[PDB]
Amino acid sequence: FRKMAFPSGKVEGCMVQVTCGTTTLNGLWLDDVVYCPRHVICTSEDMLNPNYEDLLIRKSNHNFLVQAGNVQLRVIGHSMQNCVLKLKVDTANPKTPKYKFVRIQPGQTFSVLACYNGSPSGVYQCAMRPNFTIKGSFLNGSCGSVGFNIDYDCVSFCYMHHMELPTGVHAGTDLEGNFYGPFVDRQTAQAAGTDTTITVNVLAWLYAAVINGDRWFLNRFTTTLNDFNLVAMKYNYEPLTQDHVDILGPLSAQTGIAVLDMCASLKELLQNGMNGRTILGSALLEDEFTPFDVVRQCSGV
Amino acid sequence: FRKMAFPSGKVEGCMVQVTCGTTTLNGLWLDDVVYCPRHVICTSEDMLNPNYEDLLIRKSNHNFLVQAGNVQLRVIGHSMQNCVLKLKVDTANPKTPKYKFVRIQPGQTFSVLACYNGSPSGVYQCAMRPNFTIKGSFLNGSCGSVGFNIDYDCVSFCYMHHMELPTGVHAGTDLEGNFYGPFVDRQTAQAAGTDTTITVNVLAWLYAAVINGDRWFLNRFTTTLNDFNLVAMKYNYEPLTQDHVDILGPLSAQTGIAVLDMCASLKELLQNGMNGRTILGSALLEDEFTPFDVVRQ
Ligand SMILES: CC(C)(C)c1ccc(N(C(=O)c2c[nH]cn2)[C@@H](C(=O)NC2CCCCC2)c2cccnc2)cc1
Ligand SMILES: CC(C)(C)c1ccc(N(C(=O)c2c[nH]cn2)[C@@H](C(=O)NC2CCCCC2)c2cccnc2)cc1
């Protein structure tokens, strides 16, 4: 059981470089529009309190150099949608996949294609934390990299990278420029809130463990939703809802362990630790696999 | 710090489905050649003692059904090279990337594009274990999925997947069909040898933790190389060679921590564990990042 990213080819063909004056980052080229963070028009001076509407009124089309690999794309228009800049270019991307823009919920996972200077560098599986940050691997100039899911030939873009927070976690927007989390695209003292662990994902991962070899953490007992959430609160775990329990239905049936059965196992794990054991490859309880991830991975979708 | 894989697009455009008899698996379509495990020609009771030369001589071109997405590829010739079958096809792959075939050594990392029925399922980063196995995520029909690196748009193919071993780990070949390790493409009693931790990689990852702002595991000691190895082998760590020490030189110089000083830290880490702490987000000592991977990330 590995953390698996989606194959990234459909997205690699959309990655371009966008330079505005002195700053370079990545953009997403879909049909004849390039999408990138609006903070690309910010200068090392504007950083503290940019007036983005004013900075954009200043700009003309020629202020943006867009390069797809080695071909320069002519910019014929520019506009802002919330925190994303939209550069109209004269050529539709002939590699544009079937795609949707979607906004995901905390606890949902996606693949990230990390890019630098418009060139794909690596791909990894990530999760939207409950505090709306991404524990990504992003260096300087990674802005404009996107997160995505694929559903049988359709790429659902859910994340565009904007900034790093002082704890080294990351903040970005959906592809309509709406931020995930209470963060702003300027130089400020903002910090991620206290994060919590994605309980339904830990349960899914325990089901994935049982599906493979590891069964040592199971017991004969059951808990209640109320009793378990009292422990969840103590350990800064997200509360578990009847909806979570239903989502875990398929895995409960496959394995013969009911959700509150598994909650009893996890509750024991939270207090007594793992007593030297591991569960899959990990001494930690993993929470970046969704119920759907576990079934897709254990079924070869 | 993520275990990140190479972008998979250049490899995606090469994956095809190969069918022989009732058996389907994946092939790698480069130029006018499809590469796949030769055990696609094995029958359900050939599995214990197949004679592949005899099995192959009885096949003609049209016994191989090659499908690239929706289009059937016409097989015009076939030959066997060690444990890989090479099917010559009608058409050169237009999506063929710049590529090379490389054989890697234990401890090296690579990306795997897991595929089923010729279609890519997922991508993940992997390491070749000292016992020549791969701790992969592979299900039935994964055979012929490949492992690779990419460097300056050139794809280095280093692994083709062949089989599952009893412990749940995986064995395969280079793209010339030579197995990694003492395994054979045949149903037997074979089992992976005792595995060990890739010591040079753990040290690389400790250097990565220091390049990020984490110094908590360092100490004021040093060690000789022989004393380090005598201790580390008691935890099933691979011996650290002078080659390994030279290879870490760049990370040592970037961080100002002598290689044998980092070895002293590791020795103490093995003795104490983590005491409820984390290094680069992990509660275990991570060994599937190489000195090269740390510099890149
Ligand atoms: C304009 C604005 C909003 C202040 C800004 C400035 C720099 C960047 N960062 C670029 O790397 C970058 C930006 N444009 C080209 N490159 C880095 C970044 O977030 N530093 C933050 C630290 C101080 C507080 C705000 C910025 C970065 C991003 C991702 C991974 N590691 C480092 C992101 C946003
Ligand atoms: C003919 C030969 C060499 C014995 C063979 C037989 C089956 C396969 N397995 C295919 O799934 C498969 C075969 N052809 C299409 N799919 C599986 C496999 O390895 N071992 C089984 C047979 C060998 C002995 C133990 C288990 C497999 C499962 C999961 C991930 N990886 C591979 C591989 C090789």
From Swiss-Prot, chain B:
Q: Which ranges does the record list as Cytoplasmic topological domains?
A: 1-297
**Domain of life, per lineage:** Viruses
Note how its activity is modulated. Inhibited by pyridone-containing alpha-ketoamides compounds 13a and 13b. In turn, alpha-ketoamide 13b (tert-butyl (1-((S)-1-(((S)-4-(benzylamino)-3,4-dioxo-1-((S)-2-oxopyrrolidin-3-yl)butan-2-yl)amino)-3-cyclopropyl-1-oxopropan-2-yl)-2-oxo-1,2-dihydropyridin-3-yl)carbamate) inhibits SARS-CoV-2 replication in human lung cells. Inhibited ex vivo by michael acceptor inhibitor N3. Inhibited ex vivo by compound 11a and 11b.
What does the UniProt entry say about where the protein is found?
Host cytoplasm; Host Golgi apparatus; Host nucleus
What outcome is documented for mutating residue 88 to R in this protein? In strain: Beta/B.1.351
Its UniProt entry gives the catalysed reaction(s) as: TSAVLQ-|-SGFRK-NH2 and SGVTFQ-|-GKFKK the two peptides corresponding to the two self-cleavage sites of the SARS 3C-like proteinase are the two most reactive peptide substrates. The enzyme exhibits a strong preference for substrates containing Gln at P1 position and Leu at P2 position
Task: Enter cross-link residues for Glycyl lysine isopeptide (Lys-Gly) (interchain with G-Cter in ubiquitin).
Answer: 3, 88
Boundaries of each Peptidase C30 domain copy?
1-297
Describe the effect of residue 203 to V: In strain: Zeta/P.2
What is this protein for, i.e. what is its function? Cleaves the C-terminus of replicase polyprotein at 11 sites. Recognizes substrates containing the core sequence [ILMVF]-Q-|-[SGACN]. Cleaves and inactivates human TRMT1, preventing tRNA guanine(26)-dimethylation of tRNAs. May cleave human NLRP1 in lung epithelial cells, thereby activating the NLRP1 inflammasome pathway. May cleave human GSDMD, triggering alternative GSDME-mediated epithelial cell death upon activation of the NLRP1 inflammasome, which may enhance the release interleukins 1B, 6, 16 and 18. Also able to bind an ADP-ribose-1''-phosphate (ADRP).
How would you summarize the oligomeric state and partners of this protein?
3CL-PRO exists as monomer and homodimer. Only the homodimer shows catalytic activity. Interacts with host FBXO22; this interaction promotes the proteasomal degradation of nsp5.
What protein am I looking at?
Answer: 3C-like proteinase nsp5
> Organism source for this protein?
Severe acute respiratory syndrome coronavirus 2 (2019-nCoV)
Q: Which residues of the full protein are shown?
A: 3266 to 3562 of 4405
